[PDB]
Design a protein around this nucleic acid. Sequence first.
RNA 1: AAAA
Lengths: 61, 60, 61, 60, 61, 61
Amino acid sequence: NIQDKALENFKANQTEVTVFFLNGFQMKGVIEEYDKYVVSLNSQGKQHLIYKHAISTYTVE
Amino acid sequence: NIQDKALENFKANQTEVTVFFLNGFQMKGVIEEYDKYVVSLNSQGKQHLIYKHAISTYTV
Amino acid sequence: NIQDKALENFKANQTEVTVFFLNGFQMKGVIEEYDKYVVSLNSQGKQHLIYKHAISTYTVE
Amino acid sequence: NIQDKALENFKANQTEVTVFFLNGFQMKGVIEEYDKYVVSLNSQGKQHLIYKHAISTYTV
Amino acid sequence: NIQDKALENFKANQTEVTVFFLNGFQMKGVIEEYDKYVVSLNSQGKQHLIYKHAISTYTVE
Amino acid sequence: ENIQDKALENFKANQTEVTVFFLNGFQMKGVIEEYDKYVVSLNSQGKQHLIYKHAISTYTV
RNA sequence: AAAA
Ligand SMILES: [Zn+2]
Ligand SMILES: [Zn+2]
Ligand SMILES: [Zn+2]
Ligand SMILES: [Zn+2]
Ligand SMILES: [Zn+2]
Ligand SMILES: [Zn+2]
Ligand SMILES: [Zn+2]
Ligand SMILES: [Zn+2]
Ligand SMILES: [Zn+2]
Ligand SMILES: [Zn+2]
Ligand SMILES: [Zn+2]
Ligand SMILES: [Zn+2]
């Protein structure tokens, strides 16, 4: 399972992820927790509850 | 369930939540009610029944 | 079920519901019928048969 | 099942239907057939096979 | 059903079909294979694996 | 019969240079490292991208 | 990221 091992790894290491949204929007932060439908991203120190259906890509480097 | 937990909590505390839509529209309001498919958001007094498929992000 | 209770109500009382679409379009009319997949809105001299997947929000003002 | 009955009506009577698409685009024609996932719309003398997921509204 | 019948005929006849995408883009080509979820389309000299969820319409010419 | 999983495994095994087109018109060239039912991991321009399939229109080779 |  690539999705979970990936999110798990982002979460455990607290890596700075860039999240790209379907509509073109992007946001950088840290994944704090996630389940099947949502991802909780801490960005600019503030919490965001994001639906996976709204997400295109997670990017890191 | 992370989703239900957060919605449960926004509702209990009648907190003013910002809801972003897929299309980039954004609406500010309080969660009154929600189910497996919809969110009820009171904004400027008026109720809005929103489908979850149309929602991008909740923030505060 | 929130959705199903709200639509039953819109329908029973013949309220002038405004429907917003995912792509931001906006339609205003009376809900005459609905099932798991579609809503039927008698708008301005036309019957509109709408898919729920295309709906963003119902409101009334 | 409002959907299937509506479509059966459109097909049986060859009623002029305007199909509106998610992206706002629109097309008028006669429904020649349909199944669970698609609608066969004849428009300007050409067959169109449309996915229901692409459709926002049917208007008559 | 309607779908499988149409795609099978596109495939067996090597019909040049136009694929319209949800975002308006369009591609012209021949259908090499398809399954429940994807359509393989030869177009502009290249191979394409298209998701049905992104397809809006097929038409011939 | 399962075109999608056959193609992805080929892309991964042969390290084919794949262009991923997204529903929102944007596109990304690279190589597939991992995929599963819901996501694809695409190495491109030095970056790891984790892309949701629901956000993908087409793979082009 | 405000449904013009
Ligand atoms: Zn969802
Ligand atoms: Zn409002
Ligand atoms: Zn839905
Ligand atoms: Zn924010
Ligand atoms: Zn109208
Ligand atoms: Zn639908
Ligand atoms: Zn046409
Ligand atoms: Zn579909
Ligand atoms: Zn799909
Ligand atoms: Zn990149
Ligand atoms: Zn998905
Ligand atoms: Zn191409």
